Amino acid sequence: HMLIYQAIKLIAQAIKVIAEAIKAIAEGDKERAKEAAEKARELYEKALELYKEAKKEGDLIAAAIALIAAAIAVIALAIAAIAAGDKELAKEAAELAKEIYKLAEKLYKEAKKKGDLIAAAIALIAAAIAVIALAIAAIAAGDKELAKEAAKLAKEVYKEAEELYREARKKGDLIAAAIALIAAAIAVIALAIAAIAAGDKELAKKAAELAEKVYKEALKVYKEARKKGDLIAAAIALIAAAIAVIALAIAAIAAGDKELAKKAAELAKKVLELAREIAKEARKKGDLIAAAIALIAAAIAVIALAIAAIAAGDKEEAKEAYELAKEVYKEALEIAKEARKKGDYIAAAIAAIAAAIAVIAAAIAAIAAGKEEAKEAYKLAKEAKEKAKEIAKEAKKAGDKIAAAIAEIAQAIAEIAQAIAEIAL
């Protein structure tokens, strides 16, 4: 759909504003933050209007992707509230996050009733991202009451995501089950950040427990999907596992428990090995979309590794994660080059996304290791952006509008990696 295509483009625009807000933090520019705040408001309104049009037509997936775009916009607003130090900006972001949350929660209930378990899971992703925006808005506002509100909403999404996962697993909707576990994992991240905001190590310990549970359910789905030869479903399950390990690493920071940090690093390495393995099998079979999705999970796993190195204060662990990020980056570019030569521009665009996420991991690992590596991550971020720009151009010339939009997401993610690298610089 033109509505799905529209929603993917808005997701790309919303991610780019996140990068501008991060750039305002690194440079300390209050004027850039206000500019980013204004851009986030406009994008949020565009996403709301797309969601309204999509729901009226009955397109539940397109409406769900639009609400994700809206929720990412609120995170940009929240982030901007930090760069500006404007507590009224954070309070405005807090209310927009609740609005998006309620729309997404209602959208999930409607999709599940109609049987659209995929739309329901994507709707729950929008809700979980909205809760992350609320928890960040709590940090920006210094409001432990908003943080507690985020914590309660995170448990609600996690509960519903776990419910939909078991419902989707019963009828054999393995892709819907895996996407449901992605929402659950993002919900645990939101709970972990809410624990940092609330300064509650008890909530942090709870987030660590839930992250281990989502992780365990994700590996169950990956094993079942793999046995049946459904490599795309198995790859999406590994995305959920990798996001769960990110939640655990953040929870370890919130709890100040280096034993959880070392455990996250262990789980992150396992996901990394499973994803790289699944990518090789898909590549031999020519299933380049599955291979590209697997390398997204690999790139997210290295992010968890880098954050686990921050939680452990281990500069040697940070250097290893940096080198692993460069490895996943090169594999992703291999999948993209092969995909572009065959004309599978969606597989190429998905692989471009994996490459840009791998540069985020390199940038975060450079921060943990402490400046020459940050400069390299910065330059690698420019290169990933350029590779995604070429893919978007080739896709448009091939008449593949959705692949062009997926590549725009890759461009914006590379811009986030560039901004994070600028923080270290």
Author numbering: -1 to 368, 370 to 424
Task: Quote the study on this structure.
Here we describe efficient routes starting from validated parallel and antiparallel peptide assemblies to design two families of α-helical barrel proteins with central channels that bind small molecules. Computational designs are seeded by the sequences and structures of defined de novo oligomeric barrel-forming peptides, and adjacent helices are connected by loop building. For targets with antiparallel helices, short loops are sufficient.
Encouraged by the successful design of sc-apCC-6 and sc-CC-7, we extended the seeded design approaches to target α-helical barrel proteins with five, six and eight central helices. By contrast, the six- and eight-helix-based targets bound dye, consistent with accessible cavities, which were confirmed by SEC-SAXS and X-ray crystal structures solved using molecular replacement. Together, these additional designs delivered the de novo proteins sc-CC-5, sc-CC-6 and sc-CC-8. However, the symmetry of the central parallel helices is maintained. The backbone RMSD values for the repeating helix–turn–helix–turn–helix motifs are ≤0.5 Å, which is expected given the low sequence variation in the loops and the hydrophobic cores of these buttressing helices. The parallel designs all showed some similarity with natural and designed helical solenoid proteins.
